Amino acid sequence: MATEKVTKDVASDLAGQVKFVNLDAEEKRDRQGTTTRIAPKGGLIWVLSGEVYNLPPGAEPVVKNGDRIEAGAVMAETTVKTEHGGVVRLPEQQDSKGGREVEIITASVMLDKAKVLKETQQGREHYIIETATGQRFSLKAAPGTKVANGQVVAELIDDRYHTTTGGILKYADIEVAKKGKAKQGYEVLKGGTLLWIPEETHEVNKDISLLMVEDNQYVEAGTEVVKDIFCQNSGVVEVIQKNDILREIIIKPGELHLVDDPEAARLKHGTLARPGEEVLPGLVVDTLSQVDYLEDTPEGPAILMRPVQEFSVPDEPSVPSQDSSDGSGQSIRLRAVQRLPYKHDERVKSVDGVDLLRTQLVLEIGSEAPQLAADIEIVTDEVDPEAQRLQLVILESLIIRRDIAADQTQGSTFTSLLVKDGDHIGPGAVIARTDIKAKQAGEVQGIVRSGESVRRILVVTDSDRLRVETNGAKPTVKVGDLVRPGDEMAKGVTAPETAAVMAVADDHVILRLARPYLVSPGAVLQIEEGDLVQRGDNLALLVFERAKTG
């Protein structure tokens, strides 16, 4: 063949309601084409003029068909509800692209009896939480920051577990959770004592010729073991070299007791000699010490008594008093945990001091919280006294768009807030109601008669109605008729414009303005009988066969 399939669509030139008059509407189903609204014979689509209002998706109409409404009346209202009801907080006038924000604290915990201060000292300002016990915690989250579940909030400022240099760490009755060190070490589960044997380890790579000390030579703090390396502590210098170059030098504090045949001693190089024990005949141990067999030291073979210091570790750390307002499936807590960053027999190579027990407050949420949550932490003022307190809150932020001025397709809007800044709200409660104002006064027509699908409302105004005066005649037109220009509706009176007469009396006839649209056969209807359309809305699309050059 030699033709081409074309489509021209028929858009309405006015807002109104769609009426089929003598228009067969067919629903055609094909094997793959499926459903298609067609006008098999073609016809007329009438648009009864009216001001059509698109409603927001939550709108519930407050007007029924036939009501007469003044201009600016509320045609429908929408409601904003709260999922997971809690205590409402109303934020500032943050014109975030116009919308107002409302937050709902669904759960909260606050450290009562603990005061937050801002220690301008220590370089730059830091938040410090002081408890009634006197403990000071450095706050590790600046105000207004979101905090995930399990995150460390504050860290105890604690010099009881700070060492002088590196060394060797062993446990005694302490049971830790074998967690990956991804969380800064191992959590303490059962308490006990932790034993620390100092040794100052220096990583070096210069050749052995750059040594100013002999192996296992006891040295004082001020001396320089290497020309560029000064030691920080007094002790025995252990020199590790494997390739004619120094690998590391270790300074081992202790008490040197001279011996012949150190291996012959009774307590072995398995160390850990309790006070009062005889490592060697005539040698008794004063304080808890570790045996260190040394041969080829200056002054001959010896055994070094490494002094081990102990740190007592409680099963649970001291927990600050906290008041929890938990609700709605969410349980919030600040759990106090003790973390050991070092393993139970690890050699901690260091020159300067080391901290080996970190006490931390850890966020604990998610008893039944879906997808966990995030705690926004704030520094608020306590109700009774004049101090500052720390609080962590899970909130639900809802946004109310401000309002809209009237446009062609929608009326003006007026939002109204039903809740105050300190109210205890329940689940599903209404916090805001939005009114959709009318543009012009008129009579409401054609609400979607189904429920929750009320998307458009038509209102006929004095720009869609016309009263035509029949003076002496009786009108020759009936209430159902569609008049065209020039048509005799009554004796000596003709229709001024296309419309449908809505009321017929003896003195007057009232007609609703309408526009017809011709539809060629086989056109695809884009609209259903009774649908409310705006200007430019597609009513149908006509399918043409056109000459195609080629």
Are 75 and 63 a contacting pair, CB within 8 Å?
Answer: yes
H or E element at residue 379: strand 374-381
Residue 526, number of CB atoms within 10 A of its CB:
18
CA separation for the pair 118, 111 (Å, rounded): 17
Query: What is the distance in angstroms between the CA of the first residue and the CA of the last residue of the chain?
Result: 12
E-strand ranges in 401-537 read 413-417, 430-437, 442-445, 456-460, 465-469, 482-483, 488-490, 493-494, 499-504, 508-519, 523-525, 532-533
The pairing of strands 283-284 and 146-148 is: unpaired
Q: Which two tokens stand for residue 387?
A: 């101090």
How many helices (H) and strands (E) would you count in the chain? Answer: 0, 49
**What was the experiment behind these coordinates?**
X-ray
Pairing outcome for strands 35-39 and 523-525: antiparallel
Looking at this protein, which amino acid is placed at residue 496? P
Residue 388 · residue 115 · CB < 8 Å: yes
DSSP letters, 331-355, are: --EEEEEEEE-S-TT-EE--SS--B
Provide φ and ψ at 213, rounded to 5°.
Answer: -155, 150
Secondary structure E strands in 382-487? 388-400, 413-417, 430-437, 442-445, 456-460, 465-469, 482-483
Rounded to an integer, what distance in angstroms lies between the CA atom of residue 286 and that of residue 290? 12
- 533 Cβ neighbours under 8 A, 6+ residues apart: 12, 15, 16, 17, 18, 47, 52, 527, 539
The rounded distance, in Å, linking the Cα atoms of 503 and 477 is 10
Residues 241, 202: Cα–Cα separation, whole Å: 13
d(CA 503, CA 478): 8
Closest CA to 309 of 356, 269, 351, 342: 356
Q: Are the C-beta atoms of 535 and 13 separated by less than 8 Å? A: yes
Strands 167-172, 283-284: parallel, antiparallel or unpaired by DSSP? unpaired
Closest alpha carbon to 169 in 349, 360, 358: 349
Q: Which of 398, 436, 418 is nearest to 96 (CA)?
A: 398
Q: In sequence order, what DSSP letters do the residues of 157-198 get, joined into one string?
A: ---TTB-SS-EEEEEES-EE----GGGSSEEEEE-EEEEEEE
Q: What share of the chain is helix, strand, coil (3-state, %, to 5)?
A: 0, 50, 50
**DSSP labels, 235-294:** EEEEEEESSSBEEEEEEE-SEEEE-SSGGGSSS-TT--B-TT-EEETTEE-SSSEEEEEE
Q: Can you say whether residue 247 is alpha, beta or left, with left for phi > 0 and alpha for psi between -120 and 50 degrees?
A: alpha
CA-based R_g, the chain, Å = 44
Domains of the chain, earliest start first: 3-50+464-547 (2.40.50.100), 104-191+314-396 (no CATH), 196-312 (no CATH)
How far apart CA 10 and CA 287 sit, in angstroms, is 102
Report in angstroms the alpha-carbon separations of 102 from 45, 356, 402: 47, 45, 12
CA distances from 221 to 4, 206, 546 (A): 100, 21, 103
Separation between Cα atoms, residue 403 and residue 463, nearest integer Å: 27
Cα separations (Å) of 348 from 110, 240, 277?
Answer: 38, 16, 28
CA distance 540 to 46: 12
C-beta of residue 54 within 8 angstroms of C-beta of residue 408: no
CA geometry: angle at 516 spanning 512 and 518, to 5°? 170
Which residue do the tokens 């399939």 mark?
5
Q: Give the list of residues 6+ apart from residue 364 with CB closer than 8 angstroms, or none.
A: 149, 150, 331, 332, 333, 334, 335
Helix (H, G, I), strand (E, B) or coil at 549: coil
| Cα–Cα distance for residue pair 214/229, rounded to 1 Å | 14
Q: How many CB atoms lie within 10 A of CB 220?
A: 9
CB 439 within 8 A of CB 411: yes
333 Cα distance to chain centroid? 19
Contact 150, 362 (CB under 8 A): yes
The residue count of the chain comes to 550
> Tokens standing for 58?
């939550």
What does the DSSP assignment read for 121-164?
-SSS-EEEEEETT--EEEE-S-TT-EEETT-EEEEE---TTB-S
Are 438 and 69 in contact, with CB atoms under 8 Å apart? yes
Tokens of 226: 């290497």
Q: How far is CA 88 from CA 84, 102, 183, 281, in A?
A: 11, 7, 35, 78
Amino acid at 243: N
Per DSSP, what are the bridge partners of residue 436? 76, 413
Q: Sign of the C-alpha dihedral, residues 65, 70, 76, 79?
A: negative
Return the amino acid letter for 2. A
Token pair listed for 504: 């017929």
C-alpha distance from residue 262 to each of 132, 214, 275, 300, 431 (Å): 54, 19, 19, 10, 83
Tokens encoding 442: 């008129």
